[PDB]
Amino acid sequence: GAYVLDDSDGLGREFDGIGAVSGGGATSRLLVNYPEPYRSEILDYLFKPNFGASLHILKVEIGGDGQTTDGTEPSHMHYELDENYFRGYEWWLMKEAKKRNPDIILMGLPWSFPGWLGKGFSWPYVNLQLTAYYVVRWILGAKHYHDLDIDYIGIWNERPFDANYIKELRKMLDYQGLQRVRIIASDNLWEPISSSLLLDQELWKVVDVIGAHYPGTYTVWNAKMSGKKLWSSEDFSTINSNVGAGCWSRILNQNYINGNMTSTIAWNLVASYYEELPYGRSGLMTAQEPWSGHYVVASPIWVSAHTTQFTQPGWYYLKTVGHLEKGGSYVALTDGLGNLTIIIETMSHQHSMCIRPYLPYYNVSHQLATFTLKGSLREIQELQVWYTKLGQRLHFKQLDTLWLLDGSGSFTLELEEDEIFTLTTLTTGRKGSYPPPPSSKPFPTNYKDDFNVEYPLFSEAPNFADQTGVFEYYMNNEDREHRFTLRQVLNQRPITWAADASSTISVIGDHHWTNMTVQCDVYIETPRSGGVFIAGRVNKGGILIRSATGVFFWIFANGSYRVTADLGGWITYASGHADVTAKRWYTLTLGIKGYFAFGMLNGTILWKNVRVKYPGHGWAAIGTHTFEFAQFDNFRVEAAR
Ligand SMILES: *[C@@H]1O[C@H](CO)[C@@H](O[C@@H]2O[C@H](CO)[C@@H](O)[C@H](O)[C@H]2NC(C)=O)[C@H](O)[C@H]1NC(C)=O
Ligand SMILES: *[C@@H]1O[C@H](CO)[C@@H](O[C@@H]2O[C@H](CO)[C@@H](O)[C@H](O)[C@H]2NC(C)=O)[C@H](O)[C@H]1NC(C)=O
Ligand SMILES: *[C@@H]1O[C@H](CO)[C@@H](O[C@@H]2O[C@H](CO)[C@@H](O)[C@H](O)[C@H]2NC(C)=O)[C@H](O)[C@H]1NC(C)=O
Ligand SMILES: *[C@@H]1O[C@H](CO)[C@@H](O)[C@H](O)[C@H]1NC(C)=O
Ligand SMILES: OC[C@@H]1[C@H](O)[C@H](O)[C@]2(O)CC[C@H]1N2
Ligand SMILES: [Ca+2]
Ligand code: NI
Numbered sequence: 174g175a176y177v178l179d180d181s182d183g184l185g186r187e188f189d190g191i192g193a194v195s196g197g198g199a200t201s202r203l204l205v206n207y208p209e210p211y212r213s214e215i216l217d218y219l220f221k222p223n224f225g226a227s228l229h230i231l232k233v234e235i236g237g238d239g240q241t242t243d244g245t246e247p248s249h250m251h252y253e254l255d256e257n258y259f260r261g262y263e264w265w266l267m268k269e270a271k272k273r274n275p276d277i278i279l280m281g282l283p284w285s286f287p288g289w290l291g292k293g294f295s296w297p298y299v300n301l302q303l304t305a306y307y308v309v310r311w312i313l314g315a316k317h318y319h320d321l322d323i324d325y326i327g328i329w330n331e332r333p334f335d336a337n338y339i340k341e342l343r344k345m346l347d348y349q350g351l352q353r354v355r356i357i358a359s360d361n362l363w364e365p366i367s368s369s370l371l372l373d374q375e376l377w378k379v380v381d382v383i384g385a386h387y388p389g390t391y392t393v394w395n396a397k398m399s400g401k402k403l404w405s406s407e408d409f410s411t412i413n414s415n416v417g418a419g420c421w422s423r424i425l426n427q428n429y430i431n432g433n434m435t436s437t438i439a440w441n442l443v444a445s446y447y448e449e450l451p452y453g454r455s456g457l458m459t460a461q462e463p464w465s466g467h468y469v470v471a472s473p474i475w476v477s478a479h480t481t482q483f484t485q486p487g488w489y490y491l492k493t494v495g496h497l498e499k500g501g502s503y504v505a506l507t508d509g510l511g512n513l514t515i516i517i518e519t520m521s522h523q524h525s526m527c528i529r530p531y532l533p534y535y536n537v538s539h540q541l542a543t544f545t546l547k548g549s550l551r552e553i554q555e556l557q558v559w560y561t562k563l564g565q566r567l568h569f570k571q572l573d574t575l576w577l578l579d580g581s582g583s584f585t586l587e588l589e590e591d592e593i594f595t596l597t598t599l600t601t602g603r604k605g606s607y608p609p610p611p612s613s614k615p616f617p618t619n620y621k622d623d624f625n626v627e628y629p630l631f632s633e634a635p636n637f638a639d640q641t642g643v644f645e646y647y648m649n650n651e652d653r654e655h656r657f658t659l660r661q662v663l664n665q666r667p668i669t670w671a672a673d674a675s676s677t678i679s680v681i682g683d684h685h686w687t688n689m690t691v692q693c694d695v696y697i698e699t700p701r702s703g704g705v706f707i708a709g710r711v712n713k714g715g716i717l718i719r720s721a722t723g724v725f726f727w728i729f730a731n732g733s734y735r736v737t738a739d740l741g742g743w744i745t746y747a748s749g750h751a752d753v754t755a756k757r758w759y760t761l762t763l764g765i766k767g768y769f770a771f772g773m774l775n776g777t778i779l780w781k782n783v784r785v786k787y788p789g790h791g792w793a794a795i796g797t798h799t800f801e802f803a804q805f806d807n808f809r810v811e812a813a814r
Contacts, residue, residue: 174498174542175583178491178505178515181548185490188506189402189435190278191425191481193219193226193442193457195266196234197284197330198670198715199244199638200456204445205262206463206635214607215460215468219443220273224605225470226457226477229486231270232280232406232438233263234330235311238643239285239667240674241330243446243715245639247632249311251662253289258314260632260645267321278486280438281311282327282360286668288800295668298335305338305345312351322353327360327406330670331386334359336369336376343379355381360406363388367395382406385434387529390424392432402435409439409473411527412454415563415591418472419525421457422518422563422593425480426502430494439473447638447792449684451715463635465614475561475569475604476593483514483559483597500537501588503544513550514597517542521590524563537590544596546582554578559595559602569604616683621809625657634659640718642677642797647804655696655758658804661797671716674740678718678796680711682810687790689812692762695795696804697730700755704729704798705805709765711740712791723791726763726772729798730755736772736783746770747783758806 195201207215218225236246247260258264270277286297290304297304308326315321326342328334339358346354358380359366370377383396384406396403405428411417421439428434444456445463454461457477459469484506491505501519521537546553558572575584575596586594595602622634629646637644637659647660661677689709697703710723719741727735727742734751738744751774753759762773771781793810797803 174540176493176495176503176542176544177547178493178544178550179547180491180507180550183492184507185492185494186433186435188484188486188488188490189404190229190486191436191477192228192230192232192278192438194232194407194438194440195263195442196236196241196246197440198234198241199246199446200441201262201266201443201445202244202638203461203463203636204443205265205631207460208466211466211468211610214610215443215458216269216273218458218470218474218605220270220277221605222274223482223601223603226474227274227481228277228477229481230278230280230436230438231267231442232282233267235281235283235308236261236263237283237285237667238287238663239669240641240671240716240718241284242452242671243450243638245641245643247643247645248287249314250287250307251643252287252664256310256314258318262631264315264319265631267315268319271321278324279321280325280327280357281323282330283308284330284670288665288667291668295666297329297668298338301335301338301341302345305342308342309345309349309351312354313349325355325357325382327357327384329360331361332670334366336373339376340379357382357384357404357406360384361386363393363396367393367399370399370401371395388428388432388434389530390427390431392434397433403433404436404438405434406436406438407440408437409527410452410455410529413444413456413459413471413473415472415566416524416526417455418476418563419520419591420527421473422476422479423520423525424527425476426504426516426518429490429504430496430502435490447684451717462613464617466611467613468610472563472566472568478569479559479561479593479595480516482602483595483599497540497542497588499540500535511553512598513553514595514599515544517586517588517594519588519590519592524591539587539589541585542588543583543585546577551582553598556596556598557600557602561593563591571602571604615685615814618812618814620682623807624659627657636681637679638681638714639679640714641674642679642800644679655694655804655806658696658806659808660804661802663800664802665800672719674718676740676796676798677800678721678740678794680714680792680794682793682812683814684792685790685814686710686792686812687788687814688766689793689810690762690764691793692760692809693795694758694760694806695728696758696806697755698802698804699730701730703755703801703803705803706796707761707763708794708796709763710789710791711794712789723789723794724763724765724770724785726761727798728753728759728761728774734779736770736780738786746785747780749780751779
């Protein structure tokens with residue numbers, strides 16, 4: 174089989190870049206507290222040009238205080254009249270990406286919204302101008318406080334759009350001088366956004382990109398008819414073993430070949446969240462042990478580099494792309510300056526399945542591929558070669574240059590299965606390398622945080638991964654013993670993306686912990702009705718946080734306590750009266766060992782030898798009975814795995 178690569182009959186679509194998502198939700202949570210140099214090395218593998226994944230696009234969640242898959246992410250407006258552009262870690266992340274690549278493209282998209290935007294309903298389209306005001310303030314703050322230009326704004330992640338909202342968002346953007354910001358919709362399925370654009374000229378004018386999720390490499394006729402740029406604005410979401418690398422390799426090529434999609438964006442950027450949370454280890458690489466510094470440059474990093482190091486937003490695909498006779502595919506791109514990049518993939522069915530969708534079997538076998546360069550491409554006589562074999566494996570290895578000196582403008586490759594080749598005229602490719610990082614280590618079995626940081630770099634203490642509610646460093650000047658605490662700051666349920674719990678909760682530590690003693694000072698702010706807890710063996714979080722079981726030691730401001738097996742509190746281990754009121758500091762201790770637990774109030778036994786389910790394992794946790802203010806101090810955990 175010969176394959177003509179040519180440009181004399183014109184180009185295909187403009188290539189818009191490869192990127193990844195930080196957010197939906199708290200996927201970068203454990204990255205912020207990596208020590209140096211590791212934290213910076215990780216960021217280089219992701220964003221430094223001509224090094225690792227060298228990503229063209231960074232998309233981040235616009236935190237809305239709700240649970241959005243592996244945690245919550247804090248909003249810039251927790252309450253009406255509240256504005257704070259320094260919470261969370263997406264600002265930091267975007268700035269670190271821009272430091273390494275000042276041409277990186279930036280995107281924001283909400284998953285959840287603060288509850289007050291709903292005006293009494295869990296719905297963000299009650300007051301269109303109010304919701305658009307909220308979103309636009311985020312884009313303004315990105316520029317005013319971090320010198321970040323947000324390139325694209327989305328609507329509501331995998332949730333219904335409102336056409337009047339999209340029009341209001343455009344009008345509000347323009348009113349604030351943000352004409353440069355483009356709109357992508359609707360970050361869900363091809364429909365109903367695609368037909369809506371064909372039926373509504375005014376909507377068509379204000380939507381710049383149709384972004385679909387997990388499209389299985391195909392699009393639909395209405396989207397082609399729109400004439401809009403089509404993007405796989407969220408894809409991948411597969412474990413970053415070699416099979417995830419294969420999935421990513423295949424769809425990177427075939428999203429354009431099969432579906433006219435000129436950008437693909439992987440969820441997620443880096444797996445910096447506890448692996449036992451939903452969809453664990455589904456990032457382009459792995460960085461989930463800030464305590465140890467261990468990170469893994471997983472195969473998808475080098476699959477990315479085969480495209481990103483050798484294309485840039487603003488190149489064009491050739492019209493001459495397609496599938497290989499015996500399985501796999503090729504794309505080809507130029508920059509209009511005489512450069513050419515050819516990206517070939519032979520991913521086998523068995524080693525490249527994504528979680529969404531699963532493809533019916535297709536065959537891949539050994540084959541020869543002849544490539545002939547016609548048009549303006551006949552005059553090139555030299556190609557750098559980069560090669561990857563997935564499976565023991567060889568990653569992003571540079572082979573000896575290929576020469577086309579015989580004037581036939583033609584060359585031939587022997588392809589097997591699960592291979593990637595990049596043939597390019599660019600000489601700038603590099604398999605970036607840092608020395609290996611520390612070995613993997615479990616979460617420390619003795620761990621303490623007194624939260625005594627006067628000017629913290631991030632708005633929350635390290636390693637606490639909020640799963641409902643939002644927990645923050647808090648300074649109380651009018652108190653000496655508890656001047657620096659950790660406070661739960663939501664006072665009403667968000668407009669939720671997930672099924673957030675009815676109680677707030679932040680989990681920490683080692684999911685495999687089975688015997689443990691958790692201690693924490695707690696402070697209930699709401700008189701009469703308020704309540705807090707500490708917990709151990711918490712076995713589920715993320716979008717499953719409502720499912721979490723464990724051992725939960727609750728105290729309440731009405732003078733009572735409960736011990737439950739579930740966060741929902743449907744299953745009782747023990748309960749009784751306790752000398753507990755609001756607005757007083759108490760020390761809670763919870764001991765769990767084998768079949769039995771005990772609890773202490775101020776170092777005095779409140780209950781003991783209470784039988785609990787065993788075997789069982791899970792994180793330690795803190796939280797509050799509803800969406801209510803409460804403070805925590807002097808946290809300690811000793812645990813056995
Ligand atoms: C979108 O991509 C498709 C292919 O995935 C383009 O489709 C036709 O594809 C066949 C074989 O795949 C070619 O023989 C035709 O020449 C293609 N059509 C045209 C008009 O050239 C399709 O053109 C693309 N749509 C765009 C770019 O709007
Ligand atoms: C291939 O791409 C390189 C990188 O853009 C091109 O080189 C640049 O060319 C522009 C003008 O076209 C200069 O202003 C830059 O200083 C060059 N930079 C580098 C790093 O070379 C190159 O012209 C393209 N074409 C070929 C055949 O290499
Ligand atoms: C957690 O504690 C339980 C309860 O003490 C441990 O289980 C006991 O282990 C000893 C020796 O390993 C056995 O002789 C007992 O019969 C076990 N008791 C029960 C009820 O199983 C368990 O090994 C501890 N696990 C860790 C990781 O420390
Ligand atoms: C795949 O194709 C090769 C060559 O045609 C053939 O020998 C092999 O049996 C096929 N495998 C399957 C599972 O169809
Ligand atoms: O595969 C899970 C993905 C991840 O959880 C992202 O948050 C999401 O936007 C919501 C579901 C899907 N896309
Ligand atoms: Ca303190
Ligand atoms: Ni488990």
